[PDB]
A paper describes a structure:
In pacidamycin 3, biosynthesis the 3′‐deoxy moiety is mediated by Pac13, an enzyme found to catalyze the key dehydration of uridine‐5′‐aldehyde 1 to form 3′‐deoxy‐3′,4′‐didehydrouridine‐5′‐aldehyde 2. In stark contrast to most characterised dehydratases, Pac13 is small (121 aa), monomeric, co‐factor independent and utilises a non‐activated nucleoside, rather than a free monosaccharide, as a substrate. Pac13 is the only monomeric, metal‐free cupin dehydratase characterised to date. We demonstrate here that the reaction most likely proceeds via an E1Cb mechanism, with H42 acting as an active site base, however, unlike many other dehydratases, no metal or cofactor is required for activity.
Mutants E108Q, K16R, H42Q, Y55F and Y89F were produced and purified, affording diffracting crystals of the same morphology and space group as wt Pac13, which raised our confidence that the mutants folded correctly and that the effects seen are specific to interactions with each mutated residue rather than global effects on protein folding and structure. The kinetic measurements for the activity of Y55F and K16R demonstrated lower affinity and catalytic efficiency than wt Pac13. Finally, the significant loss of activity with mutants Y89F and Y55F is consistent with their proposed involvement in stabilizing the oxyanion and underlines their important role for catalysis. Similarly, on examining the Y89F–uridine complex and Y55F–uridine complex structures, we observed a high degree of similarity with the wt enzyme. Although there are subtle shifts in the position of both the ribose and uracil rings, of the substrate, and in the orientation of the 5′ functionality, these changes are small and consistent with our hypothesis that decreased catalytic efficiency of these mutants is largely due to inability of the phenyl mutants to stabilize the transient 5′ oxo‐anion that forms during catalysis, rather than having a major effect on binding competency.
Numbering used by the authors: 1 to 121
The structure:
Amino acid sequence: MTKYKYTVEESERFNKHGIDLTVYGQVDPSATVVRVSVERGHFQEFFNVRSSYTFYVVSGQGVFYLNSEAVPAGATDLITVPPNTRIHYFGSMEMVLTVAPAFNEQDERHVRFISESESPY
Ligand SMILES: O=c1ccn([C@@H]2O[C@H](CO)[C@@H](O)[C@H]2O)c(=O)[nH]1
């Protein structure tokens, strides 16, 4: 009766500002978990007024810019970002991302675009 398991095959996969997102389709008010694949960066800076962003780095290396502060990241690191924190990032990475409470695009605010030449990856 209840669906517990979601697959990549049945997910929604799309590119957003340079990252490849896998949105599984599960609904849970407390958290959204998605996959992120990034080749060079997320070339837009935004913040979320309601939800924290927690990135687990499966593989690769990158750098997060959190309120303009560089935060290096490598495989097996956990990057935790509170609400109301400006976020962009560069890197070649595979990640698991938790947005808590559940992701709602209406909670996010655009700050600026980032030139693709700014990524050192
Ligand atoms: O469920 C989610 C989680 C994150 N993002 C996007 O992922 C990027 C940050 O990794 C941002 O563009 C953010 O809006 C989504 O589109 N949906």
